[PDB]
Each structure stands twice: as C-alpha cells, then as structure tokens.
C-alpha cells in the first residue's frame, strides 16, 4: 500500500501556526494563519534549496487569527480573530474590502457557503451567526444553540441538501437547515469537549473529535451513527482526502491516516528527536491541508513551522 | 477600598471640666444591589462557580427534531 515521505519545511513565522488554506486555481500558492497576528501568503517552488518563500503578509487583526478560508475563484480570503472581528481580504493588493462586526467576545471558526454568496461564524459568545457578503448580519441562533463555546461550524459541499454542521464544548454535534434557520438533529456520544468537525467531498459523512482521542463517524442525510476509531491521546484537526476513501487526523505530536475500506491505519507520521528535559518533548501538530492534487500534505506546528509530506510507492 | 467600605465621623462634647473627643468608624457589608452598602467587591475576594448536573456514562445515539 502507499506510504508518506518528508519533502521540506517553511520558516517565516513568529507564533503557533493556527490554520492552512488552499485552492485548485493556484497550485503554486498556499495561505496560513498564526498567533503572531498575521496571515502569510507563500510562493511555493520546486527548487532543491528550500520549498517556498513568504510572498506577502496581511496585518490588520489586533490579536491571534483563529481560522482562514479562500474563495472558489482564488481572488479573496476570509478570516476570524480573538479580537472578535471578521474580515474579507483582496489577495491581489493585500487589503480588506469589508469588515464584519456584531460578536461581543472572541471568534473560533468561519466558513463560506458552497456558492460563495453567504458567510457563517462561531464563537466563545455561544451564538452561531449568518452574514451577507455586503457585511450585514441576517440571523442569530440564540436559545437553541450550544450551552458552552461553539468550537466549529461547516457547510455541506453539495447543493441538493443545504445544511450546516457544528460541534461545541457542551460535547454535542448539531445539524441545522439553512433556509429554515432551525436545528434538525442532535448527536450524543463523546465524553470530552470537541475541537473539530469535517464532511466528505461527496456530501455523505461527518467526522468529529477532541479531548477523548476518539474519531466518530455520522451520516448527514440518513441521520444515524457509524463506527468509532480510537485515535490516541487527543484530536486537534481532521480531514478527508479529495480522491481516496481516507480519513486523516492530527493527534498530539503525530499525524495519522485510516483507510476506511476495512478500517485500518495506513501509516503514522513522526518527528526526529530533540532531547528535552520535560514532558511533551516534541512540538504538537495543530492543523492539516491536502493539496488540490491529493498527492501532497501540509501540516502546521507549535514550533512555528509548516512541514510538507509526499505520497510514495 | 477605605474610600467606599468604611464610614467615619468625629465630634466634640463640652463637660464642666473641659472638652472630650468622640470618633466613630463603621465597616459596611457588600450589597450587590439594595443601597445598604457598596456594590463593588473587595479586591482579593475571588469566588468560584460550582459545577452541576453532569452524567459520567455515555453511549452513541442520535435525536431528530
């Protein structure tokens, strides 16, 4: 079966990498966020000396940047921050065209709609919130929301079932109808708080995880439970492959992949030892992205680096 | 905190042998709203909210509206 190998590393940051984002429109570009308050745009290269260079940096947020996402045309990017404000960036000039305001705490995740005509967000303020791209808020979920911090929000990629999924510190996963503005279904099972939720590109399955170290699968349209996978110590991020039936997870200092035909671990990715006089000797992995080609993986870390892996035979 | 938790007065009284002094000081109770005392707490009085009503066991289930 297929096996990963280390390609190279990217060095231009002064705090933990918080997220990475990519598109099929520009395969020599990637974009990433950090606790150093700024978003970096990278020029990738196939040169033997170093795999990429910081090309531009976006500087307008006043605390940490928590989430970042790119428009399907590759012209614009959207981001949230621990300063409680949400911003839309023109990637050609490196300037914000609009600013979104109306949360009263601290913003943990954001997404674009699959048509890119609507925006959604989640926060420590306990409210999910919906926005028009002209910067005006359109609905607020309030009493039916999570009882604790809203950790994540995501859209289904398909057009024929317009719904969103979410996870929170009250250890529930919830599913919501877009046009009707209402809750559809709870899912219950996890013992710890939740860090992440994700959906397969065919629009069929969820995955979710957090402190309990378990990845659990769920149906989007059949409304029911599927099998549980033990990850290890903790789950920081999850993603599906774009062209294989694989789930991938970032788990403490290591990254891991499951082949879902026959439910088996393909490989686990680890770091060369730097001897350290304390517990948690290695730095942890914080975020993942597969390239639009599917053949290469980007991963971010608490040691201010992005590490790149290829597939091999 | 002395500027809002302590109430004070000083007075004189004249008796046949001369003047005596009186001084009075009172320390007020904290009153969150009601005007018996100040609404602002003392600077080193931290208080912790109690955890409630959790269930320890779980098993995976789904619940539609």
Swiss-Prot record, chain A:
Alphabetical list of PROSITE patterns matching this protein: WD_REPEATS_1, WD_REPEATS_2, WD_REPEATS_REGION
A GO CC annotation given for this chain = ribosome
Q: Which residues carry this modification: Phosphothreonine?
A: 5, 9, 95, 276
Membrane topology reported for the UniProt record: Peripheral membrane protein
The segments carrying the WD repeats are 12-43, 60-90, 102-132, 145-177, 189-219, 230-259, 280-310
Subunit and partners? Monomer; also forms homodimers and homooligomers. Interacts with CPNE3. May interact with ABCB4. Component of the small (40S) ribosomal subunit. Interacts with the 80S ribosome. Binds NHERF1. Forms a ternary complex with TRIM63 and PRKCE. Interacts with HABP4, KRT1 and OTUB1. Interacts with SRC (via SH2 domain); the interaction is enhanced by tyrosine phosphorylation of RACK1. Recruited in a circadian manner into a nuclear complex which also includes BMAL1 and PRKCA. Interacts with AR. Interacts with IGF1R but not with INSR. Interacts with ADAM12.
Official protein name in the record: Small ribosomal subunit protein RACK1
Curated annotation (Swiss-Prot), chain B:
Name of the featured protein: Small ribosomal subunit protein uS3
Gene name per UniProt: RPS3
Sequence similarity: Belongs to the universal ribosomal protein uS3 family.
The Phosphothreonine modification is found at 58-59
Q: Which residues of the full protein are shown?
A: 163 to 227 of 243
Q: Which organism is it from?
A: Oryctolagus cuniculus (Rabbit)
Q: Where in the cell is it found?
A: Cytoplasm; Nucleus; Nucleus, Nucleolus; Mitochondrion inner membrane
Instruction: Tell me where in this chain the PTM Phosphoserine is found.
Output: 47, 62
Subunit comment = Component of the 40S small ribosomal subunit. Identified in a IGF2BP1-dependent mRNP granule complex containing untranslated mRNAs. Interacts with HNRPD. Interacts with PRMT1; the interaction methylates RPS3. Interacts with SUMO1; the interaction sumoylates RPS3. Interacts with UBC9. Interacts with CDK1; the interaction phosphorylates RPS3. Interacts with PRKCD; the interaction phosphorylates RPS3. Interacts with PKB/AKT; the interaction phosphorylates RPS3.
- Primary role: Component of the small ribosomal subunit. The ribosome is a large ribonucleoprotein complex responsible for the synthesis of proteins in the cell. Has endonuclease activity and plays a role in repair of damaged DNA. Cleaves phosphodiester bonds of DNAs containing altered bases with broad specificity and cleaves supercoiled DNA more efficiently than relaxed DNA. Displays high binding affinity for 7,8-dihydro-8-oxoguanine (8-oxoG), a common DNA lesion caused by reactive oxygen species (ROS). Has also been shown to bind with similar affinity to intact and damaged DNA.
Annotated crosslink Glycyl lysine isopeptide (Lys-Gly) (interchain with G-Cter in SUMO2) location: 52
Q: How is it modified after translation?
A: Methylation by PRMT1 is required for import into the nucleolus and for ribosome assembly. Sumoylation by SUMO1 enhances protein stability through increased resistance to proteolysis.
Cross-link Glycyl lysine isopeptide (Lys-Gly) (interchain with G-Cter in ubiquitin) residue location(s):
40, 52
Highest taxon of source: Eukaryota
Question: What are the boundaries of the region Disordered?
Answer: 38-65
């Amino acid at each position: 079966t297929e096996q990963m190998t280390l390609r190279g590393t990217l060095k231009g940051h002064n705090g933990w990498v918080t997220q990475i984002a990519t598109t099929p429109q520009f395969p020599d570009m990637i974009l990433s966020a950090s606790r150093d308050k700024t978003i970096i745009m990278w020029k990738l290269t196939r040169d033997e000396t170093n795999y990429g260079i910081p090309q531009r940096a976006l500087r307008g947020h006043s605390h940490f940047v928590s989430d970042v996402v790119i428009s399907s045309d590759g012209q614009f990017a959207l981001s949230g921050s621990w300063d409680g404000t949400l911003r839309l960036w023109d990637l050609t000039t490196g300037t914000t065209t609009r600013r979104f305001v109306g949360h009263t705490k601290d913003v943990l995740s954001v997404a674009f709609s699959s048509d890119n005509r609507q925006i959604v967000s989640g926060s420590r303020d306990k409210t999910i919130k919906l926005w028009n791209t002209l910067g005006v808020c359109k609905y607020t979920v309030q009493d039916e929301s999570h009882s604790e911090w809203v950790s994540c929000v995501r859209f289904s990629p398909n057009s024929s079932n317009p719904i969103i999924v979410s996870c929170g510190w009250d250890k529930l996963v919830k599913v919501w109808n877009l046009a009707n503005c209402k809750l559809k279904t709870n899912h219950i099972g996890h013992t710890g708080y939740l860090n992440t939720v994700t959906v397969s590109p065919d629009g069929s399955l969820c995955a979710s995880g957090g402190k309990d170290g378990q990845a659990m699968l769920w149906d989007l349209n059949e409304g029911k439970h599927l099998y549980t996978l033990d990850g290890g110590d903790i789950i920081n991020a999850l993603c599906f492959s774009p062209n294989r039936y694989w789930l991938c997870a970032a788990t403490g200092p290591s990254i891991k992949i499951w082949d879902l035909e026959g439910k088996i671990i393909v490989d686990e990715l680890k770091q060369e030892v730097i001897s350290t006089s304390s517990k948690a000797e290695p730095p942890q992995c914080t975020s993942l992205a597969w390239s639009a080609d599917g053949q290469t993986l980007f991963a971010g870390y608490t040691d201010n680096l992005v590490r790149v892996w290829q597939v091999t035979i | 905190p002395v500027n809002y938790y302590v109430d004070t007065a000083v007075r004189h009284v004249l008796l046949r042998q001369g003047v005596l002094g009186i001084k009075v000081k009172i320390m007020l109770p904290w009153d969150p709203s009601g005007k018996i005392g100040p609404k602002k707490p003392l600077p080193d009085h931290v208080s912790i909210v109690e955890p409630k009503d959790e269930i320890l066991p779980t098993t995976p289930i789904s619940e539609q509206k």
